[PDB]
Amino acid sequence: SMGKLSEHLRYCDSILREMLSKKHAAYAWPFYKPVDAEALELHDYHDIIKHPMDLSTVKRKMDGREYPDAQGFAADVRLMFSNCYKYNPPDHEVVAMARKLQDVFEMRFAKMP
Ligand SMILES: CC[C@@H]1C(=O)N(C)c2cnc(Nc3ccc(C(=O)NC4CCN(C)CC4)cc3OC)nc2N1C1CCCC1
Numbered sequence: 001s002m003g004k005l006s007e008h009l010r011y012c013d014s015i016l017r018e019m020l021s022k023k024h025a026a027y028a029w030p031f032y033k034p035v036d037a038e039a040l041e042l043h044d045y046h047d048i049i050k051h052p053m054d055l056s057t058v059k060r061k062m063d064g065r066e067y068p069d070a071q072g073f074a075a076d077v078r079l080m081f082s083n084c085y086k087y088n089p090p091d092h093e094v095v096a097m098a099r100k101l102q103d104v105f106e107m108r109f110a111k112m113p
Contacts, residue, residue: 027097
């Protein structure tokens with residue numbers, strides 16, 4: 001009722017709900033919550049990744065309407081993927097998992113009306 005920007009943000013809300021849903025859990029689960037570098041014994045993670053990002057943080061910010069437009073939302077989602085590509089060996093399973101989830105994200109985002 002408030003126009004294209006309101007509709008875009010609601011569509012992005014729906015993308016996020018799908019990425020968090022059981023449908024994609026085989027590959028999305030490493031991205032549900034912030035990386036716990038202490039628990040994973042990754043003593044270099046925060047030295048390499050300066051801006052951690054994950055789906056629960058995107059959800060908090062999106063629910064608080066902290067993204068001014070859909071491009072702001074997309075930047076944080078893509079930052080999450082980019083962190084995974086930057087930190088891990090390129091042939092690691094987690095990179096393939098990030099790419100499977102990004103395939104979903106980019107497909108849905110491309111079809112935003
Ligand atoms: C932060 C680096 C990278 C990344 O980018 N993200 C996003 C990530 C997000 N979440 C996780 N989470 C878990 C990852 C592995 C395990 C696990 O159970 N590993 C077993 C432990 C015993 N044995 C060695 C066999 C394997 C549990 C996890 O959550 C509790 N891992 C992530 N990885 C991986 C971390 C090391 C390789 C890559």
